[PDB]
């Protein structure tokens with residue numbers, strides 16, 4: 001039971017690096033271009049792998065040349081893809097990403113290809129004895145709340161020394177997803193969500209939202225160059241300053257780098273304070289680099 | 297496979313992967329949005345022209361630069377989907393196969409474009425030296441790296457000097473961007489296409505103005521051609537007689553991207569079949585006008 005599993009989206013990121021964001025109805029040349037395997041859960045596996053944690057990914061992919069690229073990338077990272085929910089309806093999602101090389105800003109135009117989401121049916125088919133931690137990227141809530149319950153069930157049946165740790169990401173300001181707050185030992189909530197609920201800082205968001213998590217859970221809110229905060233059962237607010245690189249050149253996947261790093265640190269036994277900090281340390285480092293290579 | 301002597305039309309130029317996203321509204325910097333639709337397309341002038349030539353029923357080949365990879369794979373498969381011979385591609389060990397990002401605003405039609413990077417080397421004159429020409433009856437060059445392309449043209453001229461009239465390779469050139477370096481290309485080719493956009497930048501306000509004002513720059517005996525959107529197109533040859541065809545407006549205008557390339561390929565095709573310049577202008581306007589009412593190149597027949 002020593003593999004981390006991330007459940008969520010995997011998409012092909014077609015990326016252009018520009019030195020200024022283009023005004024509407026204008027035309028500008030890009031400095032360079034590349035393809036990356038992206039999606040939150042997928043980006044997190046990249047990071048876990050680079051950190052040395054055996055991990056595996058689970059999500060929908062449609063057979064094709066794109067998927068072939070993605071799988072190859074997964075494999076080069078040593079990510080287990082065996083639990084992938086292969087399909088026959090829909091395309092694999094992709095996006096156009098513009099990365100502003102002058103400040104690391106990233107603009108994402110996303111194509112969700114109707115590809116049907118992973119289901120409780122698919123999940124129930126998974127040998128949970130393989131995993132020390134399961135992270136779930138909040139997408140199809142009603143169908144994921146089910147997967148969560150299945151995980152609780154498995155836990156109710158296990159020595160505390162052998163329970164599967166669970167984390168949840170709530171990233172889009174979307175009603176259906178809020179039911180997810182109520183599950184998992186660790187809950188990640190985004191600045192975008194927090195702002196959409198009227199909160200103007202990580203600390204205010206944590207106070208405002210801790211009521212929604214389940215007893216014993218740690219709530220976590222990262223906030224870009226403000227670093228990140230966390231709040232546990234004891235009611236003590238925890239904070240970490242960011243580690244901004246002198247030149248921020250690419251923030252695409254910083255959030256996923258942070259989540260992966262917190263999970264890793266926690267799974268390794270560290271305190272929440274220490275994990276917050278390691279999360280920022282690794283995410284800040286990634287912001288100084290194009291892509292993920294070399295955060296290690 | 298075996299390609300019969302003097303059977304193919306070659307187009308030398310750019311091929312690019314265009315990623316096209318339709319959106320409700322232009323994305324603000326550092327935001328994430330869902331598009332209404334997104335499309336991968338093969339683009340580029342020489343590339344577009346090859347597609348049209350194939351649909352017209354001509355054997356045709358593309359020569360341009362690519363680098364091994366998944367972008368080139370998509371592009372090669374799309375070429376072949378259109379019956380284009382890719383065996384003359386100049387494969388590169390350095391650089392990125394061109395790809396461009398285009399964002400189309402659905403609620404005002406605007407197009408915001410991030411152009412491909414500059415990393416890939418253009419086809420060089422030494423690259424072109426290695427090509428056996430006997431295969432081709434017509435070679436068309438999209439003006440890009442002009443100093444190198446001038447050498448390619450001189451090489452074609454040398455080949456022709458030694459041939460009987462019935463095995464001379466016909467040559468055409470396109471000058472599509474207003475850049476001074478490209479202008480030396482006017483001096484090569486039996487047929488020179490100049491775009492309205494270049495004409496305008498030089499200060500000409502019509503096709504008639506452009507042809508009379510630029511004809512001086514072409515080599516003796518050459519035909520100079522200029523299409524002008526809804527005004528159709530003109531041509532001027534050595535006999536000094538300005539030739540013209542009106543446009544053939546379609547029931548409604550759906551997509552004019554690549555109309556110029558459709559026009560170019562169609563004129564080349566017609567002339568390659570031995571039609572008169574006047575017949576070719578007309579045919580070019582008919583095919584391109586038809587194309588303006590269709591999305592893409594399907595059904596231009």
Ligand SMILES: Nc1ncnc2c1ncn2[C@@H]1O[C@H](COP(=O)(O)OP(=O)(O)NP(=O)(O)O)[C@@H](O)[C@H]1O
Pocket residue numbers: 104106190191222223224225226227228242243244245248251252253254255256258279280281283284287
């Ligand atoms: N400009 C920055 N400087 C330093 N650290 C940063 C910066 N932006 C993000 N980080 C770090 O990454 C964490 C998450 O930031 P966040 O703004 O949620 O990332 P994100 O860019 O939204 N990820 P993504 O959705 O792929 O773009 C922050 O808590 C910091 O640790």
Ligand SMILES: Nc1ncnc2c1ncn2[C@@H]1O[C@H](COP(=O)(O)OP(=O)(O)NP(=O)(O)O)[C@@H](O)[C@H]1O
Pocket residue numbers: 491492523524525526527528529543544545546549552553554555556557559580581582584585588
């Ligand atoms: N709006 C139109 N209606 C009819 N025919 C058109 C139209 N636009 C272009 N064409 C035809 O396409 C030929 C080439 O026109 P050209 O101006 O080079 O097109 P383009 O620059 O590729 N696209 P656009 O600038 O939007 O017209 C013209 O000579 C016409 O035959």
Ligand SMILES: OC[C@H]1O[C@](O)(CO)[C@@H](O)[C@@H]1O
Pocket residue numbers: 011013037038039040043095108110252253254255256
């Ligand atoms: O939401 C989809 C997008 O979000 C990211 O995962 C960034 O976290 C990109 O890789 C992907 O295109």
